[PDB]
């Protein structure tokens, strides 16, 4: 029985990540697949709790228990993403791992190798688009909030993070350019992840990093 | 101006570690020296309160999710650990890193690897005592809790585990007979502890696993 694929949005903030998660699992279950979303940080658990309130900076966390905190919010959603995969539905992910990475891995003092370890193992995208956008235009889309990251300084440091990931050809990457119309970009998505949920499903579903 | 010195006190269950740990506080603090006792899982905490919950079986957490919050409970104190030890007073603590990769490497499919990992580079013991009691006069020691973890054949695969641990050379791991007296093991451990906070201090603190 025909496993659902999974497939990752990532990018810098104001890429459009979110706006083209939403927009990509409604136009595919209007083309008859089965499809949900997700996103992380998944704010409604225990953990999530903890994540957000971090982020909106209502509490301060150590930067090494903040960064296994983000991970073991994916891990607790390893069960139903192996489930839901397994009964054909395709999932749609709104940032992953590799958020999780560039984002603790542009602090001063964390390598790469120790911030990718704890994600080691999760089930592997098939495919993980990334939204480009200068993060200069991604500017013109309004302004910074007061969350935690949110300066330019701080989001260079993880763009050049999640430039070395994209180094790892053990994953599917696929660039897109994010600077078009929101329509244009959700086509370009859309195609994309037609052909990973047909073609990247016939093998099993991977771990990642290792 | 000299540092203190940490001493982590690992061995399976009912081996002694709390009463030990207790004890030698006692007697080194009798002595002269500053010194204070930590704990892991410290179960006052946010992850903490997760953590004893799950302990309890009040509550199932995913066993990778509840590995890292085990090291997050670490990490959250490593500021609190630098700044006593700078100050130089030497910290006492019951189990560390190694019981975080003993219990969870006693799980099928976790690799002693992947364990350590989340630990690598938390502060350094100067002295590791490991409390060696035949599993069975440890049953002798009153019997099971109906916590996680208390049974024979789960203690057996993390005692394994510890040993896959001692053999790390780059620690300083010395080994306790924990079947003795109370007292006669508490005075076997303040000795080893003495020669450490003297000597065991004259290098900078080191990072774990690094
Ligand atoms: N292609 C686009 N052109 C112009 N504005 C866009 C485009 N895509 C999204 N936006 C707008 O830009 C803002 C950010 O979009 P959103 O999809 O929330 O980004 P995001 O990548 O999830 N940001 P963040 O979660 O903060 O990193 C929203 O007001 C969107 O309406
Ligand atoms: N040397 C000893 N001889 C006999 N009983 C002992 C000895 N040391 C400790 N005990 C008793 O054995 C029980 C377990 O001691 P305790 O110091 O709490 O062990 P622990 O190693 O922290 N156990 P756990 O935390 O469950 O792995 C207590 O009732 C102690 O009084
Ligand atoms: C998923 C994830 C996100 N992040 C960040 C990027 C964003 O600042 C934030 C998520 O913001 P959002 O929930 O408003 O999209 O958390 C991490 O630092 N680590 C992670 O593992
Ligand atoms: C510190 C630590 C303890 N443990 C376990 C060993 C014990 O079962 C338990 C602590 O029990 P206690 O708080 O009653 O001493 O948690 C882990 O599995 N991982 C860890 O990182
Ligand atoms: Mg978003
Ligand atoms: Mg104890
Ligand atoms: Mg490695």
Redesign the pocket.
Known sequence: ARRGALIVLE??????????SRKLVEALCAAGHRAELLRFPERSTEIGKLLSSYLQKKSDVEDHSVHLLFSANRWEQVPLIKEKLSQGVTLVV?RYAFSGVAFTGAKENFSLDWCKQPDVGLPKPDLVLF?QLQLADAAK??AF?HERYENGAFQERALRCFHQLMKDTTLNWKMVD?????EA?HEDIRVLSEDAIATATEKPLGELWK
């Open positions: 990018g810098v903030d104001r890429a459009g990540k979110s706006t083209q709104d939204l889309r309004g909030g994010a600077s078009k119309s929101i970009v």
